[PDB]
Structure 1
C-alpha cells in the first residue's frame, strides 16, 4: 500500500521565451504610490525643413512615452490536513511542482502577450512543408519586414517556431538529396540551425498559442479619423495626464467577430521607413488589443499618417503610415484560418516587470515567509506558511507577482502559415 521513494518523472517543461525576455524591477515605494505603473520615454524623432528664410517656422519639441504596469499575483495556495499520511508525504513534491507550474505560467503569459500584441504580421497562402526552402522564406520575410521599417535590432532578435513547423523546416532541409553540414546536422539532430536568414536566435517553443480565425467580414471605417502623437493631455481638472503611445482607439462600422488578437490591415495605407519616411510596398498591419463597444476597437500601432494636414511638423516626424483612414477604407482581416503561430521579435520588445510582496514584515506575525525562487526564469516570490488550530490544518501559500509588457509592439511579430481561404 505505502509507496517506495522513487519518483516516476513524467513531465519536463522548458521556458525559452521567459528565459530570453528581460526582467525589470522598479523601486517598490515609488511603484506603490504610483499605482504599479511607470512611464518610459520613447526615442525622439525630429522634423526637418528645407529653405533659407524660416520666419515663424520654428517648431517645438515632442517626446512620447509608454507605460509598464503589473497584474495580479499567481498563487499556489494549498492545504495540509494534520492527520493524513498522504498530506505528510508529498508536501515537498507539491512545492517543487508549484515552482515548475509558476515558471510555466510566466512563460505562457509571455507567449500569449507576444502573439496577441505583435503588430508585424507575416502571412502565407500554404503550409510550410509544401515548397522548397519555404521555412527559410518565412524567417527571411520576418527579417526583411523588420529591416525595411528600420527597427532597432541592436540587442538581438529571435524567432520562435512551433514544434510542427520546426519539423517541417527540418524535413525541408533533409529532403535535399544532399548532405553537407547543415543537412547532416538537421538529419542527425532535428535542429535546422541556430541562426537562420539573419536572426541570431531561432528556437522552437512548445507553447505558442493558436490564433483562431476571425469571422469578421464586411467591416469598413466609419468616418475619417486622424491619430496624433501626444505626450500628455489635459483632463477635466486641467491636470496633464500622460498619454500612451502604443494604442489607438478607432471606430468601425461594426466590430462583430473581432476579439483581442486579430490582425487587420486597412486597404490603402502602407508602411513608412520610420526614420526616412520612405513609403514601403507592404500594407500596414495592425493588431486589435481590445474590443470596446460595438463600433470601437483598440489597435496597437497608432496610425500616424504622413499626409495628415492637422499634424504639426513635430508630430508628423513620428509618422508611420502613408495615408490616413478615410471613412470608407475596407479593413481586411489577415487571420482567415486557424493556425498555430510563429513569433518573432526584437529582444528588447518584451519585458517582465516584477515586484516583491513584503510579507516578511512584522505586521505579518504568526506566518513564516521565505524567498521562493522559480527556476529557469529569474523570478523570486514568497513562500508563506500559517496554520489555524480551529481546523487543525496548516495553510501553505506560494505567491509571485509580475507583469508582462510589450513596450514595442511594432517590433514583435506573428508568422501565420497556410492562411488560405
Structure 2
C-alpha cells in the first residue's frame, strides 16, 4: 500500500512543479456566485487559445478544499434540477465541467509555499535558440532537450524549485498562427543552479529577435525577447494548495524489470510482487545470515515519472491576493 502510494506523490509533484500554465485569481474560490465555474472554464480558455493539442483528452484535479467550494457554489442555487440535487446528496460536482471531460478530487496535490523573492531582475539580453543537437568538445554531436532553458538573473535568493514567474512585458503566442495573446507568459522554475542562474522549463524563443533563422523563428512561442532591465514577477504570493490540469498525454510513467530471478543470484529467494492498484510490478526477495540468525526482506520497485509537455501541464492558484 505504501509503495503504490509513492507513485501518486511523484506524479502530483512532477505536475505541480513543471506546470507552465498558471491561473492566478485575486480572490478566494467560491466568493462569488459562479466563480467556481469561471475558474475551471478559465483553464479551457488558455488551453484553447494557446493552441495546444487535447486530442487524447484533458483532465482537471481539485484539491479537497476547492472541491467543496465548487460543490458549495452549486448548492446556493435553487435545489431543483439534477445538478444541484446531486451535489446536495453527495459533494459531487459533475464529471465534466466547462469542457474538461474529467474532474476529480486528488487529496495529494502539494501546497505551493510563499516565495520570498523580491526585486529580482534579469541581467543582459538573452536569446534562446531552438536546436536539435549541438557540438561538444572533440566535435561530437550531442542531442539537446527542447524544454529547459537557463536564465541569468540579478540575484537568486528566495526563489526555489516550482516557483511560478512571469517576466514583465512578455506575452503568449498562439503557437500555430503566432498571434499575440492577452495573458502574460508564465514559467515555472524547475531548478536553481546558483545564486544567479535559474532554469525555467519552457524555452521562450522570442518572435521579434533577429538572431533566429527562419527555421527557428517558426517555433517562437513568446512575442519579445528578455531585455536587460526586465523585472521578474513572482506569481505565487499567499500559500494555497494547488489545482492541477493537463492533457492526458503530457505525463508518462516509465518502468523496467529487475532481473533478480537470474541464475547469478543463488542465495536469496525472489518472487514477483505486485503492488495493489497502480499497475506497476515489483519483486520480492529474502535472504538469511547464519552469523546473526537475522534474515533480510526486501521489496523493490523501479520506475520513473516524466512530464513530456510542461507547457500542457498547468496549475491553478486560487486566492492569490497580495
Q: Secondary structure at the match of 1:288?
A: strand
Cα offset, 1:178, TM superposition: 3.4
CA distance in 1: counterparts of 2:7 and 2:27, whole angstroms: 32
Cα offset, 1:206, TM superposition: 0.8
CA distance in 1: counterparts of 2:14 and 2:298, whole angstroms: 26
CA distance in 2: counterparts of 1:283 and 1:272, whole angstroms: 10
Cα offset, 1:341, TM superposition: 0.3
Deviations 1:267-295 (A, max 9, x none): 01100000111111110000000111111
Total equivalences in the alignment: 322
Cα offset, 1:111, TM superposition: 0.1
CA distance in 1: counterparts of 2:42 and 2:110, whole angstroms: 21
CA distance in 1: counterparts of 2:269 and 2:102, whole angstroms: 42
- Residue 205 of structure 1 is matched in structure 2 by 106
Cα offset, 1:177, TM superposition: 2.6
Structure label with greater radius of gyration? 1
Deviations 1:98-147 (A, max 9, x none): xx101110101110010001100001111112111111111111111111
Unpaired runs of 5+ residues, structure 2, are none
CA distance in 2: counterparts of 1:390 and 1:173, whole angstroms: 67
Unpaired runs of 5+ residues, structure 1, are 1-99
Q: Which of these residues, 31, 44, 65, is aligned with residue 130 of structure 1?
A: 31
Deviations 1:131-164 (A, max 9, x none): 1111111111111111101101011101000001
CA distance in 1: counterparts of 2:54 and 2:276, whole angstroms: 28
Cα offset, 1:389, TM superposition: 1.3
CA distance in 2: counterparts of 1:339 and 1:209, whole angstroms: 9
1:384 corresponds to 2:285 = yes
Q: Secondary structure at the match of 2:288?
A: strand
- Residue 281 of structure 1 is matched in structure 2 by 182
CA distance in 1: counterparts of 2:273 and 2:107, whole angstroms: 25
CA distance in 2: counterparts of 1:360 and 1:135, whole angstroms: 53
- Residue 331 of structure 1 is matched in structure 2 by 232
CA distance in 2: counterparts of 1:219 and 1:391, whole angstroms: 59
Contact 2:78 2:84 in 1 (8 A): no
CA distance in 1: counterparts of 2:288 and 2:102, whole angstroms: 48
Cα offset, 1:390, TM superposition: 1.3
Cα offset, 1:296, TM superposition: 0.5
Choose 368-377 or 287-296, whichever is displaced more: 368-377
Report runs of 4+ in structure 1 exceeding 2 Å deviation. none
Q: Which of these residues, 176, 179, 193, is aligned with residue 80 of structure 2?
A: 179
- Residue 226 of structure 1 is matched in structure 2 by 127
Q: Secondary structure at the match of 1:325?
A: coil
Q: What is the alpha-carbon root mean square deviation over aligned residues?
A: 0.7
